[model samples]
Target chain A: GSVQIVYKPVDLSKVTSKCGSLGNIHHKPGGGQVEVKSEKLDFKDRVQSKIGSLDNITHVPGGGNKKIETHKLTFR
Target chain B: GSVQIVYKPVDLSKVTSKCGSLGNIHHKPGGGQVEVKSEKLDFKDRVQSKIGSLDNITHVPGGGNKKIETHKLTFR
Candidate 1:
């Protein structure tokens, strides 16, 4: 079978790695980045895992199919 | 065939609306609430799509089958 790029789910709580969190980093593998908003992260829409990366609602100027990064986002 | 729950990709750009962004809001449909850190977000891994909401990564301490909220998250 062909190797389709796999996107896996991660549980932030039960994560057993000895590390911390942040965002807007590089993923070396797929070269993806995390996301965000204004001085307080004020949003008028909902975010979800079901919301794919193909759609660009972040307004940051970049190509969509870049490398993916492990993220640490703050919810308001 | 069956109607599987969908996890679509959103680019967080190209959104046509006069609204700003934030996180931890409510989706009247999916009943989901997001989880973040103590006034600041921190993580040690990469984020991705195709990671089904059926998985719990936010560590917010709730039943996973609740309504899904449109989220606005801030990246580091």
Candidate 2:
């Protein structure tokens, strides 16, 4: 059997401000959790980030409080 | 700056058993944690999974107790 892989182009502008541990966690356009399988190799200038730990309280409109994680990454 | 994206082709056989919340967590080839950015399209037959929560004790060889999350996904 064959499997399908999804890819998302990282927006450099947003990577700095919006990116963080669990940087962006929301339902994809259609729906489904976002998974980072791999980064595009061709783009070497690209930087990567990591989710250090998930320990924080984030309040959602109707979802109530949710545990948030911190994102750890550096740009070179 | 330009960003580089990396991709991994999912193995169907493994999806049935090995796939789960935090399905697979390990240092990428060189270094850096694995993140799931998106899933592959064009393959509608593919089923999606989710990481319900991260709460469990996992014992690593050299590492001590690690928190493990439960994966929530279904196949149609």
Candidate 3:
């Protein structure tokens, strides 16, 4: 009877979060999914948009990330 | 007299489109920006969310696009 710290917390990790969705199903990697919520969301003095490049990115080890690009967001 | 197709469209590629926004600015590559618009976007019935991955993509010469991953949207 023994227990050793496995390299992963959850080998079969199940991630659950309220990803505010008007929604659909798509993949992750490179470009990604784009879901423009509802027409009702248009009564606003606000704006939210995400821009993508004609390229994709990656993660690095110790040094700076590889050729990856991850931009933040904008909302007002 | 040089009248040959150079396989080019916009020499400087200036794109203009109505990116419905309520707005901010960010970059793109892999993990893109996230802009949560005004508080008004939370309507009665609607949802929208995008998912990204840990990798990036590129263009291919022929056949399928390279590692690029682009998913469209969902709105109702």
Candidate 4:
């Protein structure tokens, strides 16, 4: 048998700036990317700035220039 | 307002080496492990050695083994 992991993807654009920091922000039509720094992910959830469309994410590790689709578990 | 799940331990003896390679390795009996591929986590973070005692090691659908207790995000 197999168990599917499920959770909602938080929109980084909607996150409050008071919670954390987003630096060197940049975005384009071909999806967007940014850098976010947060304390260990917990509590009512948060974003790491650097927002973009899910279409711009990739899963290949260190594939030169692209965002990797590594899963981060959401906490309650 | 609730979430719960279980993470399974990794067993390298069960992985298909054809999919990915784990080479240049060694181990000990007194609860220890060894190095994996000298590959990339990101462009700047390259881990040439595998550290820590994780019981065993293997990879499956990425999130199949240990879930992310910590987030790796330095995009600021």
For candidate 2, the docking band is incorrect
Measured against the true chain A, the candidates' chain A TM-scores are: 0.14, 0.16, 0.19, 0.19
Please give the range of 10 consecutive residues that has the lowest summed lDDT in model 4 chain B: B10-19
Measured with C-alpha atoms, the lDDT of residue B66 in candidate 3 is 16
**Tens digit of per-residue lDDT, candidate 3, span B1-76:** 4222222112222222211111222243355443333444453444343333242322222121112112222222
TM-score of 4: 0.13
List, for all models, the DockQ compared with the true complex.
0.04, 0.03, 0.04, 0.02
lDDT of 1: 0.27
Off by over 4 Å in 1: A1-29, A33-37, A45-76, B1-76
- Shares of reference contacts reproduced by the candidates, in order, are 0.05, 0.04, 0.08, 0.00
Which scores higher on TM-score, 2 or 3?
3
TM-score of 3: 0.17
RMSD per candidate (Å) reads: 26.1, 32.6, 29.3, 24.6
For model 1, residues B23-57, the per-residue Cα lDDT tens digits are 24221212133332234332223533332133222
What residue runs in model 2 are displaced by over 4 Å at the alpha carbon? A1-35, A38-76, B1-34, B55-76
Each model's interface RMSD (Å)?
26.1, 32.6, 29.3, 24.6
lDDT (Cα) of model 4: 0.27
The deviation in Å at residue A16 for candidate 4 is 43
